[PDB]
Design an enzyme around this catalytic site. Structure first.
Site, PDB file in Angstrom:
ATOM      1  N   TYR A   1       0.940  -1.130   0.098  1.00  0.00           N
ATOM      2  CA  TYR A   1      -0.044  -0.103   0.082  1.00  0.00           C
ATOM      3  C   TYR A   1       0.696   1.126  -0.054  1.00  0.00           C
ATOM      4  O   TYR A   1       1.945   1.223   0.143  1.00  0.00           O
ATOM      5  CB  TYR A   1      -1.150  -0.024   1.149  1.00  0.00           C
ATOM      6  CG  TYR A   1      -0.168   0.402   2.438  1.00  0.00           C
ATOM      7  CD1 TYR A   1      -0.218   1.807   2.985  1.00  0.00           C
ATOM      8  CD2 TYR A   1      -0.151  -0.550   3.373  1.00  0.00           C
ATOM      9  CE1 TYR A   1       0.176   1.879   4.192  1.00  0.00           C
ATOM     10  CE2 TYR A   1       0.448  -0.219   4.623  1.00  0.00           C
ATOM     11  CZ  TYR A   1       0.752   1.080   4.821  1.00  0.00           C
ATOM     12  OH  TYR A   1       1.178   1.462   6.269  1.00  0.00           O
TER      13      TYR A   1
ATOM     14  N   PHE B   1       1.918  10.307   2.847  1.00  0.00           N
ATOM     15  CA  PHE B   1       2.094   9.953   4.254  1.00  0.00           C
ATOM     16  C   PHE B   1       2.809   8.551   4.782  1.00  0.00           C
ATOM     17  O   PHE B   1       3.277   8.539   5.924  1.00  0.00           O
ATOM     18  CB  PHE B   1       0.931  10.524   5.140  1.00  0.00           C
ATOM     19  CG  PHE B   1      -0.185   9.369   4.550  1.00  0.00           C
ATOM     20  CD1 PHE B   1      -0.342   8.451   5.387  1.00  0.00           C
ATOM     21  CD2 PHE B   1      -1.252   9.861   3.925  1.00  0.00           C
ATOM     22  CE1 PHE B   1      -1.370   7.784   5.200  1.00  0.00           C
ATOM     23  CE2 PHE B   1      -2.137   9.270   3.783  1.00  0.00           C
ATOM     24  CZ  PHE B   1      -2.400   8.134   4.297  1.00  0.00           C
ATOM     25  N   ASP B   2       2.715   7.433   3.927  1.00  0.00           N
ATOM     26  CA  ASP B   2       2.951   6.354   4.361  1.00  0.00           C
ATOM     27  C   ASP B   2       3.010   5.156   3.281  1.00  0.00           C
ATOM     28  O   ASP B   2       2.243   5.499   2.226  1.00  0.00           O
ATOM     29  CB  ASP B   2       2.328   5.893   5.485  1.00  0.00           C
ATOM     30  CG  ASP B   2       2.931   4.490   6.180  1.00  0.00           C
ATOM     31  OD1 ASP B   2       4.145   4.248   5.856  1.00  0.00           O
ATOM     32  OD2 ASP B   2       2.420   3.645   6.881  1.00  0.00           O
TER      33      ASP B   2
ATOM     34  N   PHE C   1      -5.498   5.808  -0.785  1.00  0.00           N
ATOM     35  CA  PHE C   1      -4.695   4.677  -0.887  1.00  0.00           C
ATOM     36  C   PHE C   1      -4.498   3.757  -2.004  1.00  0.00           C
ATOM     37  O   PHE C   1      -5.645   3.472  -2.918  1.00  0.00           O
ATOM     38  CB  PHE C   1      -5.210   3.568   0.446  1.00  0.00           C
ATOM     39  CG  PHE C   1      -5.069   4.136   1.614  1.00  0.00           C
ATOM     40  CD1 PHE C   1      -3.584   3.893   2.228  1.00  0.00           C
ATOM     41  CD2 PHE C   1      -5.840   4.726   2.443  1.00  0.00           C
ATOM     42  CE1 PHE C   1      -3.363   4.278   3.654  1.00  0.00           C
ATOM     43  CE2 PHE C   1      -5.663   5.439   3.824  1.00  0.00           C
ATOM     44  CZ  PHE C   1      -4.284   4.804   4.328  1.00  0.00           C
TER      45      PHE C   1
ATOM     46  N   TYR D   1     -10.064   8.141  10.042  1.00  0.00           N
ATOM     47  CA  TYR D   1      -9.577   8.688  11.423  1.00  0.00           C
ATOM     48  C   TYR D   1     -10.443   9.701  11.980  1.00  0.00           C
ATOM     49  O   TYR D   1     -10.395  10.234  13.041  1.00  0.00           O
ATOM     50  CB  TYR D   1      -8.253   9.166  11.550  1.00  0.00           C
ATOM     51  CG  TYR D   1      -6.955   7.952  11.226  1.00  0.00           C
ATOM     52  CD1 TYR D   1      -6.703   7.923  10.001  1.00  0.00           C
ATOM     53  CD2 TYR D   1      -6.719   6.944  12.068  1.00  0.00           C
ATOM     54  CE1 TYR D   1      -5.657   6.875   9.681  1.00  0.00           C
ATOM     55  CE2 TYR D   1      -6.046   5.999  11.908  1.00  0.00           C
ATOM     56  CZ  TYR D   1      -5.452   5.810  10.535  1.00  0.00           C
ATOM     57  OH  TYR D   1      -4.507   4.828  10.236  1.00  0.00           O
TER      58      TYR D   1
ATOM     59  N   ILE E   1      -8.762   0.715   9.832  1.00  0.00           N
ATOM     60  CA  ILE E   1      -9.858   1.548   9.547  1.00  0.00           C
ATOM     61  C   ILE E   1     -10.896   1.143   8.820  1.00  0.00           C
ATOM     62  O   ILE E   1     -10.797   0.131   7.877  1.00  0.00           O
ATOM     63  CB  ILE E   1      -9.373   3.209   8.893  1.00  0.00           C
ATOM     64  CG1 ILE E   1      -8.629   2.754   7.539  1.00  0.00           C
ATOM     65  CG2 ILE E   1      -8.476   3.788   9.898  1.00  0.00           C
ATOM     66  CD1 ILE E   1      -8.084   4.082   6.921  1.00  0.00           C
TER      67      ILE E   1
HETATM   68  C1  LIG Z   1       0.708  -0.736  18.565  1.00  0.00           C
HETATM   69  C2  LIG Z   1       0.621   0.191  17.554  1.00  0.00           C
HETATM   70  C3  LIG Z   1       1.145   0.602  16.513  1.00  0.00           C
HETATM   71  C4  LIG Z   1       0.505  -0.281  15.349  1.00  0.00           C
HETATM   72  C5  LIG Z   1       1.342  -0.083  13.979  1.00  0.00           C
HETATM   73  C6  LIG Z   1       1.486  -1.051  13.255  1.00  0.00           C
HETATM   74  C7  LIG Z   1       1.083  -2.407  13.382  1.00  0.00           C
HETATM   75  C8  LIG Z   1       2.255  -0.887  11.836  1.00  0.00           C
HETATM   76  C9  LIG Z   1       1.265  -0.535  10.638  1.00  0.00           C
HETATM   77  C10 LIG Z   1       2.167  -0.571   9.435  1.00  0.00           C
HETATM   78  C11 LIG Z   1       0.846   0.993  10.920  1.00  0.00           C
HETATM   79  C12 LIG Z   1       1.658   1.937  10.374  1.00  0.00           C
HETATM   80  O1  LIG Z   1       2.791   2.317  11.088  1.00  0.00           O
HETATM   81  C13 LIG Z   1       3.963   2.524  10.527  1.00  0.00           C
HETATM   82  C14 LIG Z   1       1.118   3.598  10.304  1.00  0.00           C
HETATM   83  O2  LIG Z   1       0.132   3.450   9.334  1.00  0.00           O
HETATM   84  C15 LIG Z   1      -0.555   4.633   8.639  1.00  0.00           C
HETATM   85  O3  LIG Z   1       0.579   5.401   8.420  1.00  0.00           O
HETATM   86  C16 LIG Z   1      -1.427   4.398   7.643  1.00  0.00           C
HETATM   87  O4  LIG Z   1      -0.928   4.258   6.661  1.00  0.00           O
HETATM   88  C17 LIG Z   1      -2.849   3.786   7.683  1.00  0.00           C
HETATM   89  O5  LIG Z   1      -3.795   4.544   7.755  1.00  0.00           O
HETATM   90  N1  LIG Z   1      -2.953   2.447   8.038  1.00  0.00           N
HETATM   91  C18 LIG Z   1      -1.929   1.343   8.067  1.00  0.00           C
HETATM   92  C19 LIG Z   1      -2.388   0.513   6.934  1.00  0.00           C
HETATM   93  C20 LIG Z   1      -3.680  -0.126   7.025  1.00  0.00           C
HETATM   94  C21 LIG Z   1      -4.871   0.935   6.910  1.00  0.00           C
HETATM   95  C22 LIG Z   1      -4.485   2.040   8.246  1.00  0.00           C
HETATM   96  C23 LIG Z   1      -4.679   1.618   9.738  1.00  0.00           C
HETATM   97  O6  LIG Z   1      -5.837   1.067   9.849  1.00  0.00           O
HETATM   98  O7  LIG Z   1      -4.001   1.485  10.567  1.00  0.00           O
HETATM   99  C24 LIG Z   1      -4.090   0.868  11.641  1.00  0.00           C
HETATM  100  C25 LIG Z   1      -4.476   2.184  12.665  1.00  0.00           C
HETATM  101  C26 LIG Z   1      -3.631   3.255  13.012  1.00  0.00           C
HETATM  102  C27 LIG Z   1      -5.684   1.975  13.502  1.00  0.00           C
HETATM  103  C28 LIG Z   1      -6.443   3.104  14.260  1.00  0.00           C
HETATM  104  C29 LIG Z   1      -6.492   2.484  15.841  1.00  0.00           C
HETATM  105  C30 LIG Z   1      -6.958   3.427  16.810  1.00  0.00           C
HETATM  106  C31 LIG Z   1      -8.418   3.735  16.221  1.00  0.00           C
HETATM  107  O8  LIG Z   1      -9.023   4.442  17.379  1.00  0.00           O
HETATM  108  C32 LIG Z   1      -8.283   4.186  14.893  1.00  0.00           C
HETATM  109  O9  LIG Z   1      -9.871   4.375  14.647  1.00  0.00           O
HETATM  110  C33 LIG Z   1     -10.250   5.517  14.183  1.00  0.00           C
HETATM  111  C34 LIG Z   1      -7.814   3.281  13.954  1.00  0.00           C
HETATM  112  C35 LIG Z   1      -2.815   0.236  12.256  1.00  0.00           C
HETATM  113  C36 LIG Z   1      -2.427  -0.831  11.202  1.00  0.00           C
HETATM  114  C37 LIG Z   1      -3.154  -0.230  13.539  1.00  0.00           C
HETATM  115  O10 LIG Z   1      -4.123  -1.386  13.520  1.00  0.00           O
HETATM  116  C38 LIG Z   1      -1.617  -0.804  14.295  1.00  0.00           C
HETATM  117  C39 LIG Z   1      -0.930   0.239  14.933  1.00  0.00           C
HETATM  118  O11 LIG Z   1      -1.245   1.229  15.227  1.00  0.00           O
HETATM  119  C40 LIG Z   1      -1.217   5.265   9.840  1.00  0.00           C
HETATM  120  C41 LIG Z   1      -1.803   6.740   9.572  1.00  0.00           C
HETATM  121  C42 LIG Z   1      -0.201   5.018  11.180  1.00  0.00           C
HETATM  122  C43 LIG Z   1       0.129   3.790  11.283  1.00  0.00           C
HETATM  123  O12 LIG Z   1       1.108   3.844  12.639  1.00  0.00           O
HETATM  124  C44 LIG Z   1       0.542   3.968  13.794  1.00  0.00           C
END
Ligand SMILES: C=CC[C@@H]1/C=C(\C)C[C@H](C)C[C@H](OC)[C@H]2O[C@@](O)(C(=O)C(=O)N3CCCC[C@H]3C(=O)O[C@H](/C(C)=C/[C@@H]3CC[C@@H](O)[C@H](OC)C3)[C@H](C)[C@@H](O)CC1=O)[C@H](C)C[C@@H]2OC
Length: 117
Positions: free
Chosen positions: A36, A46-47, A109, A92, A66
């Site tokens: 992705y 951004f990532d 994405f 988010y 998400i």
């Molecule tokens: C232990 C903690 C760290 C743990 C991190 C990892 C396993 C590494 C994994 C590659 C994430 C990336 O880290 C390099 C980085 O990816 C982003 O940059 C991104 O591209 C993104 O948007 N993604 C990731 C790819 C799937 C979709 C989405 C997501 O759903 O991501 C999920 C997300 C943030 C969900 C929130 C959770 C809180 C809720 O309240 C909110 O609900 C509104 C939704 C991620 C996968 C979480 O499940 C797991 C984590 O957070 C985020 C912008 C910020 C995130 O870093 C934090």
């Protein structure tokens, strides 16, 4: 290629860049592997999973990603590469990711469905 609505309100939508190798879609609970790249609606990246040199893996339907990703990837075929427009209320919402994603951001994405187990 045209935008294809994924949600009933047509606001979550995707553009098929590469069609899948078959008509298999991942069931709920699959451990899905993808590439992705995420951008804002300005185009700024951004990532990307490529920045870590390996596919991204998550469990489909569990709610650990998400809402736009659960609904979006579930619509993809094996091998399909698509471009998603995910509104803030499918991402988010009113929350911000510090230094990366401002509040109430639409997310773009580019996702490639590699495989699942
Ligand atoms: C232990 C903690 C760290 C743990 C991190 C990892 C396993 C590494 C994994 C590659 C994430 C990336 O880290 C390099 C980085 O990816 C982003 O940059 C991104 O591209 C993104 O948007 N993604 C990731 C790819 C799937 C979709 C989405 C997501 O759903 O991501 C999920 C997300 C943030 C969900 C929130 C959770 C809180 C809720 O309240 C909110 O609900 C509104 C939704 C991620 C996968 C979480 O499940 C797991 C984590 O957070 C985020 C912008 C910020 C995130 O870093 C934090």
């Amino acid at each position: 290629t045209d935008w294809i609505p994924i949600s009933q309100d047509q606001r979550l939508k995707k553009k098929i860049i590469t069609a899948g190798s078959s008509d298999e879609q991942p069931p709920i609970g699959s451990k899905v592997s993808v590439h992705y790249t995420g951008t804002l609606t300005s185009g700024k990246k951004f990532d990307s999973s490529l920045d870590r040199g390996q596919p991204f893996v998550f469990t489909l339907g569990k709610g650990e990603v998400i809402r736009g990703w659960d609904l979006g990837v579930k619509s993809m075929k094996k091998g399909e590469k698509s471009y998603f427009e995910i509104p803030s209320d499918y991402a988010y919402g009113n929350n911000a990711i510090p230094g990366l994603i401002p509040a109430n951001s639409t997310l773009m994405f580019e996702i490639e469905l590699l495989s699942w187990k």
